[PDB]
């Protein structure tokens, strides 16, 4: 049995989102609807077509008829931006449960937030291990598309740069880190290292001092 979901659906805040999930006469079956925010476990928000559980806001509504079951989120909030999966229950097929490909609901038009950058030098316990790792931490920024420019004193660097892709946090704002691996010889050779987090055509300062 085949379930089809649109891969991506995006709306404006306050507008309604309608997540379609189709199947040959899916109305004659029972459909559930799981909402999974990134990092959390899947949450049941609609079960048995139309019913919604406890603690689910009334704006989450469901419908199942003909060849398409639909999860209609009215008055969409940024807190609703998540992946949504329809699940069909049929105690007659050799695949009792059958999930859909899922739909990641993105809430456009969210307010931007300036990145909070925190540059960290290698540890005194790390230089004794012949290691040297710079850590550049970025928090509470939207959208989640930053470009970390690692520069050493006046010169720019290329090797050792390893940046993570931003992961959404509780306040729907993204966070990402960027590590610069170097040698203890180059740490006490230069006099200052800097992490230039370039976000939305707007860098942000951060500098450390190998002295202390």
């Amino acid at each position: 049995y085949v379930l089809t979901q649109p891969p991506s659906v995006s709306v404006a805040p306050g507008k309604t989102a309608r997540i379609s999930c189709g199947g040959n006469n899916i109305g004659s079956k029972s459909v559930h609807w799981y909402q999974q925010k990134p990092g959390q476990a899947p949450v049941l928000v609609i079960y048995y077509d139309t019913d919604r559980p406890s603690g689910i806001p009334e704006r989450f509504s469901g419908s199942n008829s003909g060849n398409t079951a639909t999860l209609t989120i009215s008055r969409v909030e940024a807190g609703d931006e998540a992946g949504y999966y329809c699940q069909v229950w049929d105690s007659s097929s050799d695949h009792p449960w059958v999930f859909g490909g899922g739909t990641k609901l993105t809430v456009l038009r969210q307010p931007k937030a300036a990145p909070s950058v925190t540059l960290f030098p290698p540890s005194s316990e790390e230089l004794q291990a012949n290691k040297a790792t710079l850590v550049c931490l970025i928090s509470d920024f939207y959208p989640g598309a930053v470009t970390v420019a690692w520069k050493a004193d006046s010169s720019p660097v290329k090797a050792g740069v390893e940046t993570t892709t931003p992961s959404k946090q509780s306040n729907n704002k993204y966070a990402a880190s960027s590590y610069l691996s170097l040698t203890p010889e180059q740490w006490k050779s230069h006099r200052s290292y800097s992490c230039q987090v370039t976000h939305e055509g707007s860098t942000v300062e951060k500098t450390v001092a190998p002295t202390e």
């Binding site: 559930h32 799981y34 476990a41 899947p42 049941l44 079960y47 559980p53 999966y85 699940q87 229950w89 050799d94 695949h95 009792p96 449960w97 059958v98 999930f99 859909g100 490909g101 899922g102 925190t118 960290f120 030098p121 290698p122 540890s123 316990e125 790390e126 790792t133 850590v135 931490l137 928090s139 390893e162 940046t163 993570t164 892709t165 931003p166 992961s167 946090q169 509780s170 966070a175 990402a176 880190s177 590590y179 691996s181």
Partner: protein, 187 residues
């Protein structure tokens, strides 16, 4: 009324691992259990159907003839034997109450097959506003707890075959990992 998945970790490819699911708050026997997995970032996937206190089994084709499901009605626990582990089986495995009432989902446990040897996180302090570096661990199951005597973490990155994560607090560090629980204090 809760479900507790456990037994996941790091296994070598082609190996075997046993997953458990402790039940509580209901008559475990009268309701059908399911195993549901989910590749990282990908979609959901049903794995195995075990039926009620009886014995009726249904399998996902990916693990058909490989994984084996079982349950203990007296001890109120569900089991899922996994065989010939592959990278297609590296996922978050969930144990769910298929029944009359709203389905119960326990917090899933991660199973990760890996080509590198399992290793414990190494903690280094970070000062300038203060932080905690946890690097050279495997698999990525890091978690920070900032308990001091007198709050959210960052995602991990891959460096040289192992992962590394960090964090920081507002204005002693302790992390939990199956290979080893580490601690470090900062000034």
């Amino acid at each position: 009324v809760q479900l507790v998945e456990s037994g996941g970790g790091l296994v070598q490819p082609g190996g075997s691992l046993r997953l458990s699911c402790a039940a509580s708050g209901f008559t475990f026997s009268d309701y059908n259990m399911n195993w549901v997995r989910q590749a990282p970032g990908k979609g959901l996937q049903w794995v195995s159907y075990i039926s009620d206190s009886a014995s009726t089994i249904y399998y996902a084709d990916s693990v058909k003839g490989r994984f084996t499901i079982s349950r203990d009605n007296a001890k109120n626990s569900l089991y899922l034997q996994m065989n010939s582990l592959r990278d297609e089986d590296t996922a978050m495995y969930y144990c769910a109450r298929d029944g009359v009432g709203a389905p119960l989902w326990g917090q899933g446990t991660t199973v990760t097959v890996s080509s590198g040897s399992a290793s414990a996180p190494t903690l280094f302090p970070l000062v300038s506003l203060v932080g905690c570096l946890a690097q050279d661990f495997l698999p990525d199951s890091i978690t920070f707890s900032w308990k001091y005597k007198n709050t959210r973490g960052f995602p991990s990155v891959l460096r040289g075959g192992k992962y590394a994560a960090t964090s920081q607090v507002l204005l002693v560090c302790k992390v939990q990992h199956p290979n080893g629980n580490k601690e470090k204090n900062v000034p």
